[PDB]
Design a protein around this ligand. Sequence first.
Ligand SMILES: [Cl-]
Lengths: 82, 94
Amino acid sequence: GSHMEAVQNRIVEAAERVPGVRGVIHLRARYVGQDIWADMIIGVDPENTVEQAEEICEAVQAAVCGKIRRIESLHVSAHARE
Amino acid sequence: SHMEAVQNRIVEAAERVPGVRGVIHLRARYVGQDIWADMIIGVDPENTVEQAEEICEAVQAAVCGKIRRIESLHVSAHAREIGDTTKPSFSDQP
Ligand SMILES: [Cl-]
């Protein structure tokens, strides 16, 4: 509901502030008990290395998980984007 | 389960594709007679993202080409060091 959109907006806002992120392409978030499990795809520079893209991915994980307490599990991956 | 033969075929297939440093993970199930799968490959860290997506597509074509009962296969890549010998996982979500 309205409840869930608010958290999604929090997650996007958080992820999008992280340097190297070219928008959030996709976000699946779901309640499992009281906790949230999420899967996210970010856009990144096509010319990034895989190592570099994974660094950005981890940074997003820390930023999002840091600001939204109720997230128990967050997978982040990157697609090339312009 | 009973279906180790197909898993081994899938891994062997994927691992022959150039740019693949082993299969990190594979979730496969039968739906009727068809197989639906999700797979994670290891790749050169120094590959570009563009290039890793290219490898991913190559694996999709190679695996789906050699194991014809696969109706749907998603492939994604993580960086993997060359000294890594970690056996492929077949669980349901790391
Ligand atoms: Cl061949």
